[PDB]
Each structure stands twice: as structure tokens, then as C-alpha cells.
Amino acid sequence: SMSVKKPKRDDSKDLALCSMILTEMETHEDAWPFLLPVNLKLVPGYKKVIKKPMDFSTIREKLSSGQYPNLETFALDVRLVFDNCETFNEDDSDIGRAGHNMRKYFEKKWTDTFKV
């Protein structure tokens, strides 16, 4: 509260570290469905169904232009990518499987990098 401050973690490296994690996501062999925005003009249903589209290139742009206030807002956008993927793709599909794989991959890196 006012004049009662918790000790908080050192956050000076967070931007660099999130960039590192995003780079590893971008270079993962199963990243291909998530590298660019879904084409809302070529993919029926997507615009109406998916209220907040997100992809790695958009996250990269937001990261590079100071649009994430903190690391948690970054993680929210990464998770949004995979939540959108689950919404629109069957688990037993190539893209569906890719999304589950990439979520698992991210969350381990998240824990290992920041959950000390």
C-alpha cells in the first residue's frame, strides 16, 4: 500500500529475455502456423469467431516497439496465440498438434527463465 513496498524482482533483463524466448519460438520447426497473422480474407470463419487474433510476428512488433508494459502482458499474448489455435483447430490436426506442442515448449521456457 502507500509507502509499504514489497521487494520486487529485478526486471531490467525482461525485455532481452522475452526476445530470446520469442526467437526460440520463431525458430521451432512447428512455428509455421503462427509466424504470420491468419489471413482474415482467405480463411472463412476466422474473423467472426476469433475476437483477438495474435501471431508471433505481431508479438515481435509489439515487443520491439515498447507495447508490452511488463513480462506478464507478453505471456498473455503468447498464450492467446495458442488459445486461438485451440478454438479454431481440431486437436487431431497438424496445426492443432503444433499449437499444443508450442504451448508446452513456451511454458517450460517461461518457467525456466523467470520462475528462477
Side-chain angles (χ1 to χ4, degrees):
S1 64
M2 197 187 319
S3 307
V4 178
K5 289 321 159 22
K6 176 177 338 191
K8 339 297 203 307
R9 52 180 298 282
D10 177 17
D11 67 347
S12 60
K13 302 308 231 321
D14 286 4
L15 185 56
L17 290 166
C18 286
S19 181
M20 160 191 104
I21 292 171
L22 186 63
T23 295
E24 288 160 347
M25 305 288 281
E26 292 161 333
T27 57
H28 191 298
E29 93 167 82
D30 297 343
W32 56 269
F34 313 116
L35 293 176
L36 298 176
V38 176
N39 190 328
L40 302 179
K41 284 20 192 176
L42 295 210
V43 180
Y46 207 83
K47 195 177 177 190
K48 184 57 172 284
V49 173
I50 302 299
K51 298 308 178 177
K52 306 238 301 287
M54 186 54 53
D55 71 283
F56 295 169
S57 74
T58 298
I59 297 174
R60 177 62 73 180
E61 181 65 37
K62 292 178 61 169
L63 195 61
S64 293
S65 58
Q67 297 187 56
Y68 294 115
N70 57 51
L71 75 176
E72 296 304 330
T73 58
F74 170 82
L76 288 175
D77 261 2
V78 174
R79 292 170 181 146
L80 177 58
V81 174
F82 306 128
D83 290 344
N84 288 344
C85 182
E86 280 203 56
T87 295
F88 210 78
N89 297 276
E90 289 286 343
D91 295 341
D92 187 3
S93 65
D94 292 288
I95 291 175
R97 257 165 275 159
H100 292 297
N101 285 353
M102 292 305 306
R103 187 197 294 276
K104 184 78 178 191
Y105 188 74
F106 170 71
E107 295 296 353
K108 187 204 196 314
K109 290 194 168 311
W110 194 251
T111 296
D112 289 351
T113 301
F114 291 113
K115 271 67 181 179
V116 176

